[PDB]
Every structure is written in C-alpha cells, then in structure tokens.
C-alpha cells in the first residue's frame, strides 16, 4: 500500500460499456472497504481481526462473529458478499450502487445492519 500502477489497453470501452468506470468504482469500493476495516481493526478491533485484500476480493476475518468477505470477480458482473459463516451475497451494480434482489437490498446495508445486530446483539 504505497505504490501505483496503470492499465490502459486502448479506448475500447468508450465504444462499449463503461469499463473504466467499473474498475474505478469497484476499485475504490473494495479499497475503501479493506481500508476502513483495516483502520478499525488496527485502531480498535476487539480481539484479533484480520483484513485481507485480494485481486477482486476483500477478506475480513472477525474473531467474534465470523469472517466477512466481499469480492466482485464473478463470471459476469456482481459483488459476492461472503457472510461471517459461509453465505456469499451476489449484489448487482445499480447506477453506482450494488444491490441484491433485482433492486431491493444493498451490500453496505446488509453488512452494516448484519454486523451491527451481530455485534450489538450482546453488547
């Protein structure tokens, strides 16, 4: 986390779907996810959490409720949210908003509400 890179294989997206926008949002989305969790687990975790970042995947281990994961490297275009147990959520991109259920629920919404009621359920 400090270096930089680039990947421009000719303006082949300008004629088709907004590929650049997809890599920009998805890149910032996953990055911001592991960035916030990393700072929260390092600044004030709880027991011994672990934030891992993979190419198109955001692993987040939580030694209290389980392990949360969020990737977007499907055979098409979606964000899989691996629950703290073993339940990936296939979220679809919505004009810049990943929601599941043909437009019903949101990722950060289910993850924030789930983790909130999962960690607060006791505290």
Brief overview:
The protein has 123 residues and is of the alpha+beta class. The protein contains two helices and seven strands. The PDB classes it as chaperone.
Task: Give structural notes.
- The protein has one domain (17-123): Frataxin/CyaY (Metal Transport, Frataxin, Chain A, 2-Layer Sandwich), CATH 3.30.920.
- Strands 1-2-3-4-5-6-7 form a seven-stranded antiparallel sheet.
- The protein is built from two helices and seven strands.
- The chain has helices spanning 19-43, 107-119; strands at residues 50-54, 57-62, 66-71, 79-82, 90-94, 97-100, 105-106.
- Strand 2 (57-62) and strand 3 (66-71) form a beta hairpin.
- It is α+β, with helices and mostly antiparallel strands and 123 residues long.
- This is Frataxin homolog, mitochondrial.
- The PDB classes it as chaperone.
- The entry lists the keywords Yfh1, Chaperone.
- The assembly is monomeric.
């Amino acid at each position: 986390m400090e270096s930089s890179t680039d990947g421009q294989v000719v303006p082949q997206e300008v004629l088709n779907l907004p590929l650049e926008k997809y890599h920009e949002e998805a890149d910032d989305y996953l990055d911001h996810l592991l960035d916030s969790l990393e700072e929260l687990s390092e600044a004030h975790p709880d027991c011994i959490p672990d934030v891992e970042l993979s190419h198109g995947v955001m692993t987040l281990e939580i030694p209290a409720f389980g392990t949360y994961v969020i990737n977007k490297q499907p055979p098409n275009k979606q964000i899989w949210l691996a629950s703290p147990l073993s339940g990936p959520n296939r979220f679809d991109l919505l004009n810049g908003e990943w929601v599941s259920l043909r437009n019903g629920t949101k990722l950060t919404d289910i993850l924030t509400e789930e983790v909130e009621k999962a960690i607060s359920k006791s505290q």
